[PDB]
Amino acid sequence: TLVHVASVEKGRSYEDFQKVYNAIALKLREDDEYDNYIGYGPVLVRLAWHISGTWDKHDNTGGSYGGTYRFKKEFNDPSNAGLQNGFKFLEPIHKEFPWISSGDLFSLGGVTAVQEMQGPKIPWRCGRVDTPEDTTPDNGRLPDADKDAGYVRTFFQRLNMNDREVVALMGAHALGKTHLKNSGYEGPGGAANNVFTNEFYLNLLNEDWKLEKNDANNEQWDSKSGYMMLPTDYSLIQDPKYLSIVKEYANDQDKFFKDFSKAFEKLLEDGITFPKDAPSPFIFKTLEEQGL
Numbered sequence: 181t182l183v184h185v186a187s188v189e190k191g192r193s194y195e196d197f198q199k200v201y202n203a204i205a206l207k208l209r210e211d212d213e214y215d216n217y218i219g220y221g222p223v224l225v226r227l228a229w230h231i232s233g234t235w236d237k238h239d240n241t242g243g244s245y246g247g248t249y250r251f252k253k254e255f256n257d258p259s260n261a262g263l264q265n266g267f268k269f270l271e272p273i274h275k276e277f278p279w280i281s282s283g284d285l286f287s288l289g290g291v292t293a294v295q296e297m298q299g300p301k302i303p304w305r306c307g308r309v310d311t312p313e314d315t316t317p318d319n320g321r322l323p324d325a326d327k328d329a330g331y332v333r334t335f336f337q338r339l340n341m342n343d344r345e346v347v348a349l350m351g352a353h354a355l356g357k358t359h360l361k362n363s364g365y366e367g368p369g370g371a372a373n374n375v376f377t378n379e380f381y382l383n384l385l386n387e388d389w390k391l392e393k394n395d396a397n398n399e400q401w402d403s404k405s406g407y408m409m410l411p412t413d414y415s416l417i418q419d420p421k422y423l424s425i426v427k428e429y430a431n432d433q434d435k436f437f438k439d440f441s442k443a444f445e446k447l448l449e450d451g452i453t454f455p456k457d458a459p460s461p462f463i464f465k466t467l468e469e470q471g472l
């Protein structure tokens with residue numbers, strides 16, 4: 181029942197935020213060696229999700245608004261292991277643009293990464309305001325990966341996401357890789373892991389998956405092509421309701437893009453009250469669209 185009202189950084193408008201977007205995008209292009217040349221796109225998407233996914237609809241605790249990932253309790257959450265790389269990437273961006281709030285920066289990082297990786301446009305709204313250290317949510321609000329479809333479904337009800345929204349959001353798992361030292365899981369999900377596509381769904385349906393144990397003694401689904409799916413990923417083809425939606429996105433790139441864009445914006449905005457006279461959501465141009 182907490183209320184968080186969006187408050188525009190004083191005097192700022194679209195052009196200010198496009199400059200921040202551009203600085204993130206230029207650094208994504210420049211720092212290309214990260215994670216054996218995957219680059220920082222995937223980890224920035226994951227950061228934006230984890231700072232948002234602490235939200236609880238029941239009392240409006242957590243969520244992106246407060247920028248609380250900057251505090252030790254949250255940045256040391258075992259569920260956030262590896263995200264420090266994303267935070268470090270954003271540090272020089274914040275130094276250049278010290279006026280942007282932490283929640284705005286973390287969420288904008290995710291939007292920028294999706295778009296620069298040739299994903300859908302994600303409308304984005306400013307006005308998250310840093311809140312104090314005692315507003316940092318406790319660890320344990322982000323999801324476990326060893327679980328089944330019923331767990332996933334129930335988990336996401338706390339974030340006010342339905343089946344379609346869950347399956348759309350999970351398509352982000354096309355990106356990057358699991359790293360044994362971070363999460364106890366190892367490997368990429370496909371060949372296209374720094375360009376945003378519907379490959380997650382295609383690979384779920386088309387690869388021959390085998391349930392194996394990794395070197396951390398955890399089960400994961402592996403293919404001979406060298407890809408993997410988490411148990412929670414694979415649950416989307418075990419549950420008949422999720423399976424229908426996986427098939428839809430595997431067969432319609434545009435629909436996946438549109439549904440992902442809506443769900444990801446919603447995820448990043450959960451918990452925030454926007455005044456009726458707040459600016460409309462911004463749609464940033466990519467570097468490519470700007471000739472930059």
Ligand code: HEM
Pocket residue numbers: 222223225226229261262323324325326332349350352353355356357358359360362363364365410412444
């Ligand atoms: C049931 C829900 C989810 C579970 C259990 C889950 C779990 C995981 C795990 C275990 C990793 C590997 C982390 C590592 O070892 O570095 C990962 C990576 C990732 N997750 Fe999720 N995740 C979920 C939902 C999502 C959502 C909703 C998004 C965004 C829309 C997302 C985006 C990502 C991205 C982009 C990576 C790759 C990060 C990198 O390459 O550094 N995940 N996830």
Ligand SMILES: Cn1cccc1CN
Pocket residue numbers: 353354355356357358367368369370408409410413
């Ligand atoms: C690449 N990735 C990220 C999370 C899970 C996976 C593999 N399907």
